[PDB]
Design a protein around this ligand. Structure first.
Ligand SMILES: O=C(c1c(F)ccc(NS(=O)(=O)c2ccc(C(F)(F)F)cc2)c1F)c1c[nH]c2ncc(Cl)cc12
Ligand SMILES: O=C(c1c(F)ccc(NS(=O)(=O)c2ccc(C(F)(F)F)cc2)c1F)c1c[nH]c2ncc(Cl)cc12
Lengths: 261, 261
């Protein structure tokens, strides 16, 4: 279709790293781009169908807080091409650097993430893997939600109880996206990952599933707004249908951002 | 279609100003947006067809240096919705402020503009009205090429001789876009508009048409690269088909930017 980029047009550059189901490279195509070369070689009919479905979903996204899809390749192999983002992931800023954001900045990041998610859900798109390592801070300022996944057990902390239980075939929903966002809020407000005092991964899975273990909200920073702590608890509610939806989440965080400037 | 935004979803805010064929407003729709309400009321079949054509062209643009189309409205009236840009136009920075960009910055702006235009031309899209007032410096850093046109005779300085002559019905081409870009380069390197020492608009039109008047390239700044001055003269060549195309223009400006960092 019209988003297919013919072979030879993109000059592939530096190998950035192993992403989600592919290898990401910086590239040149009318400026800078990112190019994820999918791991699949000799794809089955169902792998080609799944690729076309995902391109179809990405084609429906036009929002500043969603990583900008730019095109795809078929030959010599499957690939997704997007805008190049400058900087690092939110995971890197929060958990792999000595940079400490001020509360105004943290709330701005929460607001922009909420803008992107509110947008996705309005178009009936479920992310399914929202987490800080899938949020990029383009130019250290603009949230870009995507599927970066750079260096699974590395999504366990963001999984809602119904997802982690896996008691049904498709537990992913708007509501489980909201829970994952609640964990992102926990990361922003505490600067930390949840359950850091438990060293057994299998026991985190079991306890989050049965509702005996939840994020310790007493660890939020002293200047985290009371309303943000309340909103976070709502997003993290163990019962799927007691969680808020994104229009309200966005509206409240937008007001928190407005008060800070 | 799937880019139509139902009425009631967008909260229309501040009136920004009269744009090209419409009135621009800041709005709220999953975050910030811009909304141009077209002037046309009770559109004819051909005005509705022209609107659908333009949305069709905007749908083909996914590039960081092209203003991000987000959707459109039909009722109660025709409207184009895009991302909201922070800051002001390149025209404002160069000709309506005492801010003076350094040469590194000027060349960065030229590079990003070239990225956007190279992209458009690769998809066979002719802008037809490239000028500094149609280039926005989003967050004072990122070029966004669009159709802003905020407060015609206000495109005369960017018109190639064949356009200004109007000796045929459709003188707009990739090549006339390149000429307009050459005038944008003149704006960046001199900080000025061409022909400022002539106070008669009708005489500018006649002389640019017959090739007796061209931009005074001796006014470029002392630290404007010799290669940029040469490239600019090539873009401004009076004969349509002696001008370069954007792949080469982009490559050369990219190298100028690379040397400066
Ligand atoms: O890792 C990626 C990447 C990529 F190369 C291709 C595709 C994606 N994600 S994506 O498949 O297009 C995507 C998936 C889901 C969504 C959403 F948000 F659900 F809509 C948006 C985008 C990436 F995150 C990067 C894209 N731009 C970058 N800039 C810098 C770096 Cl270090 C990585 C990247
Ligand atoms: O003036 C506009 C505007 C708008 F409201 C609607 C549409 C457009 N342009 S556009 O029709 O979508 C458009 C037209 C042509 C192109 C291109 F580049 F040819 F592809 C891209 C975009 C605007 F420039 C602004 C868009 N975002 C803004 N942010 C701030 C301000 Cl002050 C104005 C605006």
């Amino acid at each position: 279709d019209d988003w297919e980029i013919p072979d030879g047009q993109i000059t592939v550059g530096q190998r950035i790293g192993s992403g989600s189901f592919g290898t990401v490279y910086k590239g040149k195509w009318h400026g800078d781009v990112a190019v994820k070369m999918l791991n699949v070689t000799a794809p089955t009919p169902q792998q080609l169908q799944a690729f076309k479905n995902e391109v179809g979903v990405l084609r429906k996204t036009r929002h500043v807080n969603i990583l900008l899809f730019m095109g795809y390749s078929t030959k010599p192999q499957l690939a997704i091409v997007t805008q190049w983002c400058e900087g690092s992931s939110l995971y890197h800023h929060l958990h792999a650097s000595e940079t400490k954001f001020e509360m105004k900045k943290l709330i701005d990041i929460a607001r922009q993430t909420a803008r992107g998610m509110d947008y996705l859900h309005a178009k009936s798109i479920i992310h399914r893997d929202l987490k800080s390592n899938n949020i990029f801070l383009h130019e250290d300022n603009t949230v870009k939600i995507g599927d970066f996944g750079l260096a699974l057990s590395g999504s366990i902390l963001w999984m809602a109880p119904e997802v982690i239980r896996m008691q049904d075939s498709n537990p992913y929903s708007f509501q489980s996206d909201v829970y994952a966002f609640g964990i992102v809020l926990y990361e922003l407000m505490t600067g930390q990952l949840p359950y850091s005092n438990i060293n057994n991964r299998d026991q985190i899975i079991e306890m989050v599933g049965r509702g005996s273990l939840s994020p310790d909200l007493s660890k939020v920073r002293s200047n985290c707004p009371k309303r943000m702590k309340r909103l976070m608890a709502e997003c993290l509610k163990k019962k799927r249908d007691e969680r808020p939806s994104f229009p309200r989440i966005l509206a409240e965080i937008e007001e928190l951002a407005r008060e800070l400037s």
